[PDB]
Amino acid sequence: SLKPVMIIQFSASEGPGHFGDFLAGEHIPFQVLRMDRSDPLPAEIRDCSGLAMMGGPMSANDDLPWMPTLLALIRDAVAQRVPVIGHCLGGQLLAKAMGGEVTDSPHAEIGWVRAWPQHVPQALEWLGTWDELELFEWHYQTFSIPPGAVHILRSEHCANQAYVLDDLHIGFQCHIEMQAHMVREWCSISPEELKGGAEADPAQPMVQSAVEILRDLDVRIATLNRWAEHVYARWIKGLQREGHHHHHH
């Protein structure tokens, strides 16, 4: 009888991914709302046990009809201790709601990138390790670290890969939700953004080709899935739960 996790989705192609499968395997109910279909947001954040946000094909700075309402809802989640998890745009929106800014990156990241946890105990707790990680990226902008948050992960071309707030909320620039078929799908929807593509700037130091992105895909997805599951397992410890005051046997 847990209240559902509310998942905010911004397009048809960017679904819950591994996160959805993880919740299904925990028998945690979840409800998706599509911002691109103008689905209404709940007035009361406490109607959900936790708030998750996926990525989307827009900038966090774009002037969209649901933007003020969603930023206010994120603020309410943080005030009410309803945990928030944000993936790519979702990480950016968590940061913006809390006072951070989203700006254009000097260089984009598209494909598999080397990343290093910050040497802080929060990185060990949430990511499982201080060892190098491999991240899946597809982004042109970056969040600042929001006030009160702890920076936990960096890459060469994007220092701000992840942060944690209040031991409860976590935002990522990268996509920890990926499954192999989604990588394939995204590459097929937008091939021109990839190295060699019609829209790609050949000077980009961290934009990979389709061939590079698909190389050893299943094995590197399994690697990602395992530490993503560590993050998700930590994050759900924070779900809001109505305490029973009596039984019903």
UniProtKB/TrEMBL annotation:
Q: Output the superkingdom of the source species.
A: Bacteria
Q: Could you tell me which species this protein originates from?
A: Methylobacillus flagellatus (strain ATCC 51484 / DSM 6875 / VKM B-1610 / KT)
Q: Name one GO cellular component term.
A: cytosol
Q: What is this protein called?
A: Glutamine amidotransferase domain-containing protein
PROSITE patterns listed in its UniProt record = GATASE_TYPE_1
Query: Boundaries of each Glutamine amidotransferase domain copy?
Result: 32-179
